[PDB]
Coordinates of N, CA and C in Angstrom, one line a residue:
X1 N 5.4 2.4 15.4 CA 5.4 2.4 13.9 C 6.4 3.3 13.3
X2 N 7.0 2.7 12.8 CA 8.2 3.2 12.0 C 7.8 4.4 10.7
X3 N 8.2 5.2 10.1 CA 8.1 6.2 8.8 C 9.1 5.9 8.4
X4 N 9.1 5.1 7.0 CA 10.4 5.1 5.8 C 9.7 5.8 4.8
X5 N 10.4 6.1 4.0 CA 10.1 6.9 3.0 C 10.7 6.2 1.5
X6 N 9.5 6.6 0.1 CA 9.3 5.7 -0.9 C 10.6 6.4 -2.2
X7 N 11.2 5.7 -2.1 CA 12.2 6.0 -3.2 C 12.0 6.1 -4.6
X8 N 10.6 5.6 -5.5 CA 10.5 5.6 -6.8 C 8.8 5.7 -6.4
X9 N 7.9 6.0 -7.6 CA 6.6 5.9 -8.0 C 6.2 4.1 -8.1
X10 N 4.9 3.7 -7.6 CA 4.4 2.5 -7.7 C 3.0 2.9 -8.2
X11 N 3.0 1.9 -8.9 CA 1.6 1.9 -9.8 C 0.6 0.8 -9.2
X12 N 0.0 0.7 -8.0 CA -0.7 -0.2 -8.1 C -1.8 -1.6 -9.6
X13 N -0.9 -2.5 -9.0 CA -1.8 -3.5 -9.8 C -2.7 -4.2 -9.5
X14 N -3.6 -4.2 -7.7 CA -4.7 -3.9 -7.3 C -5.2 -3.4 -6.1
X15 N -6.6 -3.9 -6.3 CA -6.8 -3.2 -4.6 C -6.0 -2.9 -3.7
X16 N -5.7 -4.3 -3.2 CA -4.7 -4.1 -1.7 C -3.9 -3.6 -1.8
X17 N -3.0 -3.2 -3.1 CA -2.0 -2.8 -3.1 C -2.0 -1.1 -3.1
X18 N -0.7 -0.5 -2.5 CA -0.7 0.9 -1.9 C -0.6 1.4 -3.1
X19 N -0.8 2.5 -3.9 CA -0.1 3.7 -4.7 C 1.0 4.2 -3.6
X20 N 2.2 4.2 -4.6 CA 3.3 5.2 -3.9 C 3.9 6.4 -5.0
X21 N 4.5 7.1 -4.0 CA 5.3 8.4 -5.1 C 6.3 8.6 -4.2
X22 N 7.1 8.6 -5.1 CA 8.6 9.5 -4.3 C 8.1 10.8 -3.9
X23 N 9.2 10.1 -2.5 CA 9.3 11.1 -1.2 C 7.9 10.8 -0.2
X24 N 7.0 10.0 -0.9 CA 5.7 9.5 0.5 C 6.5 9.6 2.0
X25 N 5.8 9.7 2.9 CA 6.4 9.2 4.0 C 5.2 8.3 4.0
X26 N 5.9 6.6 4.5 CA 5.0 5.8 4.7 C 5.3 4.9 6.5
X27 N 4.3 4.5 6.8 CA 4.1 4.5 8.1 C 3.9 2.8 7.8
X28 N 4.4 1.8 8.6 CA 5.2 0.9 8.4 C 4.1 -0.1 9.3
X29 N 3.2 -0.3 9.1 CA 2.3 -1.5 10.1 C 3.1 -3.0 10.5
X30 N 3.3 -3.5 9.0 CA 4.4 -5.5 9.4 C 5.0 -5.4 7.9
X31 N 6.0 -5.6 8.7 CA 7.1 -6.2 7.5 C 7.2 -7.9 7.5
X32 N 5.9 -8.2 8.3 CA 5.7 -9.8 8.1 C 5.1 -10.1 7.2
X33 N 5.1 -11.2 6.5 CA 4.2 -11.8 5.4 C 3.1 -12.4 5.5
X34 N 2.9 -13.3 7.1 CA 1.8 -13.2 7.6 C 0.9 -12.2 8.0
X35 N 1.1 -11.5 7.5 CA -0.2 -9.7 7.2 C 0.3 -9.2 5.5
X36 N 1.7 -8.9 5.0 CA 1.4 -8.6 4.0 C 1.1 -9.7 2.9
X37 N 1.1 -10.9 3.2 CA 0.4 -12.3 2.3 C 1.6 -12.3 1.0
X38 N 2.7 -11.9 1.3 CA 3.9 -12.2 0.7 C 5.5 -11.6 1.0
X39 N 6.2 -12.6 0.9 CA 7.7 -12.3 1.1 C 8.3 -11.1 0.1
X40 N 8.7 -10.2 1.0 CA 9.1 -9.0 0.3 C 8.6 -7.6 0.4
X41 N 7.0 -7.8 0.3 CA 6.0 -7.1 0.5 C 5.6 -7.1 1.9
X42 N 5.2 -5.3 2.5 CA 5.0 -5.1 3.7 C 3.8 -3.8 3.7
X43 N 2.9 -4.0 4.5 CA 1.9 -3.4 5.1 C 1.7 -1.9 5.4
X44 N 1.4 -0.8 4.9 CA 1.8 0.1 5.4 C 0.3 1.0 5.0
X45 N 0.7 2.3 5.3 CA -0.2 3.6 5.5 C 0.0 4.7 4.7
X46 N -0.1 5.3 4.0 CA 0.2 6.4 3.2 C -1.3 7.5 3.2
X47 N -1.2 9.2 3.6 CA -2.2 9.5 3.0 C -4.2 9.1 3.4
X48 N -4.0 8.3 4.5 CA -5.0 7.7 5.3 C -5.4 6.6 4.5
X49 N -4.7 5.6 3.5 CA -5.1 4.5 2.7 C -4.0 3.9 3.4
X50 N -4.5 2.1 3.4 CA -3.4 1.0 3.9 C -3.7 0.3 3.0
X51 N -2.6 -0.5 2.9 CA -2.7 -1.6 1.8 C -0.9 -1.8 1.6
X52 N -0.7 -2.9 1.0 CA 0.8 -3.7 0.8 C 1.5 -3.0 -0.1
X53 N 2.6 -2.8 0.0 CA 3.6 -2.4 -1.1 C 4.9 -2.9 -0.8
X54 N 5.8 -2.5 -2.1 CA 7.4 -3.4 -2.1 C 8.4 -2.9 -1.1
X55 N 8.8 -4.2 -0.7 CA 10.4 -3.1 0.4 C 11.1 -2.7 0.1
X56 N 11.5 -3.2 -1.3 CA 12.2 -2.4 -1.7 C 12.2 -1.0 -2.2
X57 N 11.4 -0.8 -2.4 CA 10.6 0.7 -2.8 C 10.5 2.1 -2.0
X58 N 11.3 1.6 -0.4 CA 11.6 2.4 0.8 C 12.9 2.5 0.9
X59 N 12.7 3.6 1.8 CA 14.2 3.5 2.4 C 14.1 4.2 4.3
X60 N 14.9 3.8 5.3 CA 14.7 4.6 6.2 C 14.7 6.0 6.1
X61 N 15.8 6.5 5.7 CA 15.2 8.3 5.5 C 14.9 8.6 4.2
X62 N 14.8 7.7 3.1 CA 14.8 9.0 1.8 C 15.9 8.4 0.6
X63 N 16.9 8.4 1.1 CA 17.9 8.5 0.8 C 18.4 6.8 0.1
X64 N 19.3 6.7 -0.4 CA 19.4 5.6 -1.2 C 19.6 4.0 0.0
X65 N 19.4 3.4 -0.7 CA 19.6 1.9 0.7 C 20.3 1.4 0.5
X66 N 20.4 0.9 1.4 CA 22.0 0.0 2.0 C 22.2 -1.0 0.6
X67 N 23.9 -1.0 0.2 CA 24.2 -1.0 -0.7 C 24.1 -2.9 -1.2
X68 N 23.7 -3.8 -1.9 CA 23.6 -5.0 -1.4 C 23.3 -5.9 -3.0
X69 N 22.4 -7.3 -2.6 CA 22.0 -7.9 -3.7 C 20.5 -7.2 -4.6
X70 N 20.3 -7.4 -5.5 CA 19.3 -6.6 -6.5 C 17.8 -7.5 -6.0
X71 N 16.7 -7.2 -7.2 CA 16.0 -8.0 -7.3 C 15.9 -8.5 -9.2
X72 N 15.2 -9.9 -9.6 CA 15.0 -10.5 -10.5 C 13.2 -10.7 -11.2
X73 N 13.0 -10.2 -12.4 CA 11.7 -10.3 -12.9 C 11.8 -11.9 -13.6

């Protein structure tokens, strides 16, 4: 199990979903969708709570991510 780390604060909008804060180290269970029950969204551990949060919201060390296409609301 991989440790990436949370680049901005997440506000959970429910249950399943993780609370994050910059700088979490988060512990990385599936980056499949068949466990996180959506594309994009991945499985993980923070703080002894599990529950789904955004990929994009990580990064491997901390530090900014690979440089690329955005996302759209």
């Amino acid at each position: 199990n991989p440790v990436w780390t949370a680049l901005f604060d997440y506000e959970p909008s429910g249950q399943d979903e993780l609370a994050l804060r910059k700088g979490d180290r988060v512990e990385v269970l599936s980056r499949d969708a068949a466990i996180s029950g959506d594309e994009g969204w991945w499985a993980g551990q923070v703080g002894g709570q599990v529950g789904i949060f955004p990929s994009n919201y990580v990064s491997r060390g901390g530090g900014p991510p690979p440089p690329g296409p955005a996302v759209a609301e």
